[PDB]
mmCIF file of C-alpha atoms and ligand atoms in Angstrom:
data_model
loop_
_atom_site.group_PDB
_atom_site.id
_atom_site.type_symbol
_atom_site.label_atom_id
_atom_site.label_comp_id
_atom_site.label_asym_id
_atom_site.label_seq_id
_atom_site.Cartn_x
_atom_site.Cartn_y
_atom_site.Cartn_z
ATOM 1 C CA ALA A 243 24.665 14.069 13.461
ATOM 2 C CA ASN A 244 28.195 14.307 15.003
ATOM 3 C CA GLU A 245 30.838 16.965 14.504
ATOM 4 C CA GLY A 246 33.090 16.077 11.541
ATOM 5 C CA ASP A 247 30.559 13.755 9.811
ATOM 6 C CA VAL A 248 29.949 14.259 6.089
ATOM 7 C CA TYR A 249 26.444 13.799 4.646
ATOM 8 C CA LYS A 250 25.456 13.453 0.986
ATOM 9 C CA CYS A 251 22.115 14.016 -0.758
ATOM 10 C CA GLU A 252 21.758 11.061 -3.171
ATOM 11 C CA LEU A 253 19.381 12.924 -5.507
ATOM 12 C CA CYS A 254 21.095 16.277 -6.182
ATOM 13 C CA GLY A 255 24.701 15.372 -5.067
ATOM 14 C CA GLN A 256 25.028 18.124 -2.423
ATOM 15 C CA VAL A 257 27.602 17.227 0.250
ATOM 16 C CA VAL A 258 27.853 18.944 3.655
ATOM 17 C CA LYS A 259 30.201 18.578 6.651
ATOM 18 C CA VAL A 260 28.785 18.866 10.216
ATOM 19 C CA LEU A 261 30.574 21.665 12.137
ATOM 20 C CA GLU A 262 28.311 21.708 15.200
ATOM 21 C CA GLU A 263 26.304 18.639 16.138
ATOM 22 C CA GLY A 264 22.568 18.800 16.579
ATOM 23 C CA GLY A 265 20.170 15.868 16.724
ATOM 24 C CA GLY A 266 17.900 16.962 13.873
ATOM 25 C CA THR A 267 17.783 14.945 10.634
ATOM 26 C CA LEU A 268 19.401 16.581 7.643
ATOM 27 C CA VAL A 269 17.053 16.445 4.663
ATOM 28 C CA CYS A 270 17.617 17.499 1.069
ATOM 29 C CA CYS A 271 15.343 16.922 -1.999
ATOM 30 C CA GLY A 272 12.570 15.440 0.189
ATOM 31 C CA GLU A 273 14.875 12.656 1.504
ATOM 32 C CA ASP A 274 17.239 12.027 4.428
ATOM 33 C CA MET A 275 20.869 12.775 3.627
ATOM 34 C CA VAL A 276 23.234 9.762 3.880
ATOM 35 C CA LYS A 277 26.233 9.673 6.212
ATOM 36 C CA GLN A 278 29.449 9.140 4.310
ATOM 37 C CA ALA B 1202 23.341 25.842 -1.589
ATOM 38 C CA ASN B 1203 26.869 26.887 -2.807
ATOM 39 C CA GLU B 1204 30.404 25.567 -1.797
ATOM 40 C CA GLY B 1205 31.802 27.099 1.400
ATOM 41 C CA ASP B 1206 28.313 28.257 2.585
ATOM 42 C CA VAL B 1207 27.537 27.756 6.250
ATOM 43 C CA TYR B 1208 23.950 26.885 7.294
ATOM 44 C CA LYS B 1209 22.457 26.645 10.791
ATOM 45 C CA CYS B 1210 19.340 24.952 12.119
ATOM 46 C CA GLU B 1211 17.909 27.498 14.598
ATOM 47 C CA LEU B 1212 15.879 24.821 16.425
ATOM 48 C CA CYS B 1213 18.547 22.261 17.295
ATOM 49 C CA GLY B 1214 21.706 24.334 16.687
ATOM 50 C CA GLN B 1215 23.190 21.944 14.061
ATOM 51 C CA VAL B 1216 25.623 23.798 11.748
ATOM 52 C CA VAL B 1217 26.819 22.442 8.391
ATOM 53 C CA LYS B 1218 29.212 23.728 5.757
ATOM 54 C CA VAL B 1219 28.596 22.942 2.069
ATOM 55 C CA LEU B 1220 31.449 20.946 0.466
ATOM 56 C CA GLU B 1221 29.836 20.195 -2.919
ATOM 57 C CA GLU B 1222 26.921 22.283 -4.129
ATOM 58 C CA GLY B 1223 23.543 20.856 -5.079
ATOM 59 C CA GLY B 1224 20.258 22.541 -6.019
ATOM 60 C CA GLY B 1225 18.262 21.025 -3.110
ATOM 61 C CA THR B 1226 17.271 23.118 -0.029
ATOM 62 C CA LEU B 1227 18.937 22.002 3.223
ATOM 63 C CA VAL B 1228 16.301 21.168 5.874
ATOM 64 C CA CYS B 1229 16.755 20.259 9.541
ATOM 65 C CA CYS B 1230 14.046 19.691 12.195
ATOM 66 C CA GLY B 1231 11.449 20.117 9.491
ATOM 67 C CA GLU B 1232 12.486 23.640 8.396
ATOM 68 C CA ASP B 1233 14.880 25.383 6.073
ATOM 69 C CA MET B 1234 18.336 25.818 7.541
ATOM 70 C CA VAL B 1235 19.390 29.480 7.685
ATOM 71 C CA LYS B 1236 22.485 30.666 5.767
ATOM 72 C CA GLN B 1237 25.007 32.374 8.042
HETATM 73 FE FE1 FE C 625 17.696 20.844 13.474
HETATM 74 FE FE1 FE C 626 19.353 17.256 -2.603
#
């Protein structure tokens, strides 16, 4: 994802902010995190 | 992970910071992101 984006896990509610972009998909609780 | 924690994907270099904690394990590029 891109620097500054915020991603949320819909199942457990964990929210992270991207500090350094990478192209990998962020996954949490067996599912792709959702860009906010 | 817990609020304020920083995690890195060693494969693609993506770095995230936890804003709201959740009990799920952060995964990127198919493996567990490493706490810094
Ligand atoms: Fe990755
Ligand atoms: Fe989760």
